[PDB]
Amino acid sequence: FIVEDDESLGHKELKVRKGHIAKLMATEYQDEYTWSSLLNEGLVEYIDAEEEESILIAMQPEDLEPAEADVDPAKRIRVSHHATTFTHCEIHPSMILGVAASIIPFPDHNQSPRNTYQSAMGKQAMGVFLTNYNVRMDTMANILYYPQKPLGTTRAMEYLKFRELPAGQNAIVAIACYSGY
Amino acid sequence: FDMGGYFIINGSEKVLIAQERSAGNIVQVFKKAAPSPISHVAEIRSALE
Amino acid sequence: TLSHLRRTNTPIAKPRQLHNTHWGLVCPAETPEGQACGLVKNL
């Protein structure tokens, strides 16, 4: 996202406003205002590593924008927006992630490598790999008889079509000692 | 649901795995460590686009 | 299949470690374990 102080009305703020969001989802319900729209209106912009050097990025927007002129115990502990010098906003932190990783649920609650495993193991899982599976003559393939979408999901799963072509089943699970088997 | 982006060569689907490399035409200075007659070096790997 | 089409190889002073610059471009987590650890990255 692009940030400018560009506001007679108050402080520093993202070019993108809730109006564009309306205009965006207008075109979503129609399944005019594309991504390329945001990109030529200059509300949003491409940044490589080199250019990244010379900017300052807000994590969340809303949270990291208006100052201050009680707090949730259970929640994590976020720093702040003490800076006024913002140039850009992160669209959403969860996109620092890759495909495989974007299936791991609550991965921000795991020992760092427990993620690195599952983001390799899921590539050895089983399910519906393409809907034309019946007509393909691949040398080796496995399909799950009754795949289920997962009960716990990622917003990013939406784009990976994971709900529409899953990898497992929701098993009623007990964590218990039993027969020692 | 197929996303494409692959090739079909003799039946089997091939993917071209992206290759990483140092960018060229770029100026970089490095310290050449202890045993060297040289102490610092400025390289540029230069090439026609 | 997806994750295979967002895959990067990096042949051959310290390539394997997760660099700061890799923020937002490469997955911090999705790498092979072993001979190609951190050498095969995923976008």
């Binding site: 996202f1 703020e13 993202l14 993108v16 406003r17 809730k18 109006g19 564009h20 969001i21 309306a22 965006l24 989802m25 075109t27 979503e28 205002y33 594309t34 991504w35 390329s36 945001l38 949003v44 969340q60 927007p61 809303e62 949270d63 924008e65 208006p66 669209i91 959403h92 996109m95 495909v99 917003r155 939406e158 784009y159 990976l160 | 996303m3 494409g4 982006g5 692959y6 071209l16 992206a18 | 997806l2 089409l5 967002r6 976008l43």
Partner: peptide, 30 residues
């Protein structure tokens, strides 16, 4: 108020339209 500040949940809408355009294999194609 079509020029209001944008909330966190709103970013997804943008992210949605990103993939409408590029899809998951943007790079390989382009």
């Amino acid at each position: 108020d079509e020029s209001a500040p944008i909330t966190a949940e709103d970013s997804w809408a943008v992210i949605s339209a990103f993939f409408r355009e590029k899809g998951l294999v943007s790079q390989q194609l382009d």
